[PDB]
């Protein structure tokens, strides 16, 4: 659905806003970014708009090699450049009658 897409886009972005505030939210987005090898919604640059995330700081889960603190002062070559919304979203659309039906 485009409801599946629009909602996932909206929710992923709202969860990015809550990432600094809620360590459970942080753990959830971390597992998404690490397991699907993606960062941010459209792009890693999306983190630039999130408080507690300076410029040149992304979650460690965006790193290609996840080590403690790797997202601090990150280099573009060391991070997943693709956004999570299109990548995870296409996976959700491909598995929709197993994740959302009542």
């Amino acid at each position: 659905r485009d409801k599946v897409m629009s909602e996932f886009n909206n929710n992923f972005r709202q969860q990015m806003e809550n990432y600094p505030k809620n360590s459970h939210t942080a753990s959830i987005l971390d597992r998404m970014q690490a397991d699907f090898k993606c960062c941010g919604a459209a792009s890693y640059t999306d983190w630039e708009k999130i408080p507690s995330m300076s410029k040149n700081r992304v979650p460690d889960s965006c790193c290609i090699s996840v080590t403690v603190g790797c997202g601090i002062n990150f280099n573009e070559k060391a991070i997943h450049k693709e956004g999570c919304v299109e990548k995870i979203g296409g996976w959700l659309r491909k598995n929709v009658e197993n994740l959302y039906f009542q």
Partner: nanobody, 127 residues
Framework: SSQVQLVESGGGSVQAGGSLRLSCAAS????????LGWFRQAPGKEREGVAA????????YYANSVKGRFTVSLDNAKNTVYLQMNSLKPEDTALYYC??????????????????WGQGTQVTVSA
């Protein structure tokens, strides 16, 4: 995480066509919970969502392979969520996990939205 604990019970071994009722007792800071879900991991297979209940409105969600046979329900007074399982098949054999999700994503049968997990209870269904 340790703010919420989930404890499953009611597993066992039954002959095909029989029934079980799993229960999951939630404790800790559970007022945050938006979905209570049941996941299962069968021998040799990845974990899959089976049934989920949204606390917000009581809505329920089922995997297609269990629709009509399994029912998820919540006894608020006991802080316990149930999975009634009827007409059990050998392919229902699995470790069943209780899980809980807080607010964030509205994808009830996807384990990536759930933060709290029980240890699992074994369900064995004989041919």
């Amino acid at each position: 995480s340790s703010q919420v604990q989930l404890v499953e019970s009611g597993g066992g071994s039954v002959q095909a066509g029989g029934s079980l009722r799993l229960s999951c007792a939630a404790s800790g800071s559970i007022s945050s919970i938006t979905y209570l879900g049941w996941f299962r991991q069968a021998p040799g297979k990845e974990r899959e969502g089976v049934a989920a209940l949204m606390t917000t409105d009581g809505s329920t969600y089922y995997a297609n392979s269990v629709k009509g046979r399994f029912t998820v329900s919540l006894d608020n007074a006991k802080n316990t969520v149930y999975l009634q399982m009827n007409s059990l098949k050998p392919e229902d054999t699995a470790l069943y996990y209780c899980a809980a999700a807080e607010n964030g994503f509205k994808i009830p049968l996807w384990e990536y939205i759930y933060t709290y997990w029980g240890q699992g209870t074994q369900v064995t269904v004989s041919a």
